[PDB]
Design a protein around this ligand. Structure first.
Ligand code: SF4
Ligand SMILES: [Cl-]
Ligand SMILES: [Cl-]
Length: 152
């Protein structure tokens, strides 16, 4: 029935630079109009401000370029995303690609050099570990299908 969605994909200005990543989708707009797309930002939920410095995963740690360790906030935001899914009975997530929290197919490599690698963010990894299917904004058709199959 409902899905959890990265708040930036819904146009909320919660990105590290205060920007949004609002996607153009008639389907996502309709889902939101029905009260079925729950906005959530793991980094803001975890206690990080907006704006905030860029961060990259370095294995299980998440750090900024200056070496500040923000894993505590990233892990809290991931656990709150899981908590919202369990409370609302959500089995699907639409999360922002490339993010150290929301990435699902790729993330930055931890070297702060603009290089991506195959991998997932901290929130995606925890949701997948608990049986929640995570799709990126590049997989809207697949997500829409997965949600429609259980409708009747
Ligand atoms: S943590 Fe996820 S939802 Fe929040 S701004 Fe970053 S990519 Fe978007
Ligand atoms: Cl960006
Ligand atoms: Cl990106």
């Amino acid at each position: 029935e409902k899905i959890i969605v990265s708040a930036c994909l819904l146009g909320q200005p919660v990105r590290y630079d205060g920007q949004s990543k609002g996607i153009v989708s008639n389907w996502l707009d309709a889902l939101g109009a029905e009260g079925r797309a729950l906005a959530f930002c793991p980094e803001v939920a975890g206690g990080l401000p907006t704006p905030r410095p860029p961060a990259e995963r370095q294995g299980e740690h998440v750090v900024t370029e200056s070496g500040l360790d923000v894993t505590a906030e990233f892990d809290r935001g991931a656990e709150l995303a899981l908590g919202l899914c369990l409370a609302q009975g959500i089995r699907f997530a639409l999360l922002k690609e490339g993010s150290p929290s929301c990435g699902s197919g790729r993330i930055y490599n931890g070297r702060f050099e603009g290089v991506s690698m195959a991998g997932e963010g901290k929130t995606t990894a925890l949701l997948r570990r608990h049986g929640i299917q995570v799709f990126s904004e590049d997989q809207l058709p697949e997500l829409a299908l997965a949600l429609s199959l259980v409708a009747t």
